Amino acid sequence: RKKMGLLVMAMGTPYKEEDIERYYTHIRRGRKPEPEMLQDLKDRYEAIGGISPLAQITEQQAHNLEQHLNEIQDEITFKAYIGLKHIEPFIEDAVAEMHKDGITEAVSIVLAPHFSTFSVQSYNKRAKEEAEKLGGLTITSVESWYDEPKFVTYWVDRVKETYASMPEDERENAMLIVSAHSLPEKIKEFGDPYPDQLHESAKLIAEGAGVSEYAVGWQSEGNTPDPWLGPDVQDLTRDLFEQKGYQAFVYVPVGFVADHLEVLYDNDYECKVVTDDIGASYYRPEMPNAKPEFIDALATVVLKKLG
Ligand SMILES: [Mg+2]
Ligand SMILES: [Mg+2]
């Protein structure tokens, strides 16, 4: 069998509470959070059940993906390497390790289904540049995978189950909100398809699930002076309630693949505060994490990229 590296890339998460400072410093481009922000972040992580389980999900995704790829075809043996943006093991570290280990051919995938210039393209460029610097190692990079039918089906089936679970008055008066991580609006300068891809995800999932009433929102914007993609899910939820009185909101954060702070806090707390305030029911179906159905979707994405 031919040996190939499987470079799995993601933002990263802290491994313990004491990593919060450096992780958020990295996110904030060298700006250390002030003490009240540091305490606030610690509190948020405690509220969602702790930090330890978060980074384990990414590891489990990469490992299960490796094992599943190796089991479903007989031509290639994959070895997974994790490369993260904001904490060790960094993308450049992972590529250098691949080269050290004698890998000469790799395929990469970012654990975010929509292409953007800000994240996916930047991860892919960084990986390819380090390979070029070392020589003798090439990388083929998945750019997007939101339209993989098996992935669409994951979310459609979760959404169906959620609607099926609702009392009758909710089921005929619910709103589905599909979201991803906000990015600066200025990505539009380069024709970034990120927003169009989120809207297509939303269309595909709503259509597959038989949901006629849905909306697209953004969440978890950072803090810079230039505008970020909106509307934010908190504002969208309240606006849609005021205009049409929905009694239940279903949140599908399709941009995210795991139980991390952006979902467990930015949906399950921040959006839940809003639905609680307006008297609506809150639902947010299970994230993919490292579940077999999702791992099969990822495996299919990778093998399609290789033909
Ligand atoms: Mg494509
Ligand atoms: Mg926020």
Q: If DSSP states are collapsed to H, E and C, what string results for 165-233? A: HCCHHHHCCEEEEEEEECCEHHHHHHCCCHHHHHHHHHHHHHHHHCCCCEEEEEECCCCCCCCECCCEH
Residue 4's SS3 state is strand
HSE value, Cβ hemisphere, 13 Å, CA-based, for 44: 19
The two tokens of residue 91 are 């993308």
Q: Ligand 2 center to residue 133 CA distance, Å?
A: 37
* Helical (H) or strand (E) element with 283: strand 281-283
CA pair distance 192, 170, nearest whole angstrom? 37
Identify which ligand lies nearest to the alpha carbon of 143.
1
Identify which ligand lies nearest to the alpha carbon of 301.
1
| CATH top-level class of 1-145+288-307 | alpha beta
- Where along the chain do its domains lie? 1-145+288-307, 146-287
Identify which ligand lies nearest to the alpha carbon of 232.
2
CA pair distance 247, 241, nearest whole angstrom? 8
- How many Å is the Cα radius of gyration of the chain? 20
Identify which ligand lies nearest to the alpha carbon of 271.
2
The two tokens of residue 123 are 């991860």
Q: Ligand 1 center to residue 69 CA distance, Å?
A: 20
CA pair distance 34, 21, nearest whole angstrom? 9
Q: Ligand 2 center to residue 266 CA distance, Å?
A: 6
CA pair distance 140, 147, nearest whole angstrom? 19
Asked if the peptide bond before residue 231 counts as cis, ω within 30 degrees of 0, the response is: yes
13: left (phi over 0), alpha (psi -120 to 50) or beta: beta
Q: Ligand 1 center to residue 87 CA distance, Å?
A: 28
Please give the backbone phi and psi of residue 51, each rounded to the nearest 5 degrees, phi first: -90, -45
Cβ–Cβ < 8 Å for 213, 176 = yes
Q: Are strands 248-252 and 174-181 parallel, antiparallel or unpaired?
A: parallel
* Helical (H) or strand (E) element with 253: none
Q: Ligand 2 center to residue 275 CA distance, Å?
A: 17
The two tokens of residue 185 are 């609006």
Type of residue numbered 184: P
Q: Ligand 1 center to residue 29 CA distance, Å?
A: 31
Identify which ligand lies nearest to the alpha carbon of 115.
1
Output b/e per residue, 240-252; b: 16+ Cβ within 10 A: bbeeeebbbbbbb
Residue 81's SS3 state is strand
CA pair distance 209, 271, nearest whole angstrom? 22
Identify which ligand lies nearest to the alpha carbon of 262.
2
* Helical (H) or strand (E) element with 87: none
Cβ–Cβ < 8 Å for 118, 183 = yes
Inter-axis angle of helices 120-134 and 91-100, nearest 10: 40
Please give the backbone phi and psi of residue 269, each rounded to the nearest 5 degrees, phi first: -105, -60
Tell which residue, 280, 251, 284, has the closest CA to residue 170: 280
Cβ–Cβ < 8 Å for 185, 227 = yes
Q: How far apart are the first and last CA of the chain?
A: 16
Q: Ligand 1 center to residue 144 CA distance, Å?
A: 6
**CA angle, corner 151, sides to 155 and 79, nearest 5?**
135
CA pair distance 171, 261, nearest whole angstrom? 28
CA pair distance 112, 32, nearest whole angstrom? 26
Q: Ligand 2 center to residue 236 CA distance, Å?
A: 14
Residue 150's SS3 state is helix
PDB resolution in Å = 1.6
Q: Ligand 1 center to residue 4 CA distance, Å?
A: 22
Tell which residue, 267, 114, 276, has the closest CA to residue 195: 114
Burial of 283 (0-12, 13-18, 19+ CB in 10 A): buried
Identify which ligand lies nearest to the alpha carbon of 221.
2
The two tokens of residue 66 are 């490796």
Tell which residue, 215, 107, 202, has the closest CA to residue 146: 202
**CA angle, corner 22, sides to 41 and 266, nearest 5?**
30
Longest dimension (CA), the chain: 62
Q: Ligand 1 center to residue 261 CA distance, Å?
A: 28
Tell which residue, 215, 219, 206, has the closest CA to residue 267: 219
CA pair distance 253, 157, nearest whole angstrom? 15
Residue 28's alpha-carbon distances to 31, 182, 224, 269, 292, in angstroms, are 5, 15, 9, 23, 34
- Tokens 């891809």 belong to residue: 197
Span 146-287: which CATH code? 3.40.50.1400
Q: Ligand 1 center to residue 129 CA distance, Å?
A: 23
CA pair distance 81, 59, nearest whole angstrom? 9
Identify which ligand lies nearest to the alpha carbon of 223.
2
Identify which ligand lies nearest to the alpha carbon of 304.
1
Q: Ligand 2 center to residue 265 CA distance, Å?
A: 9
- Answer whether 1-145+288-307 and 146-287 agree in fold: yes
CA pair distance 182, 230, nearest whole angstrom? 7
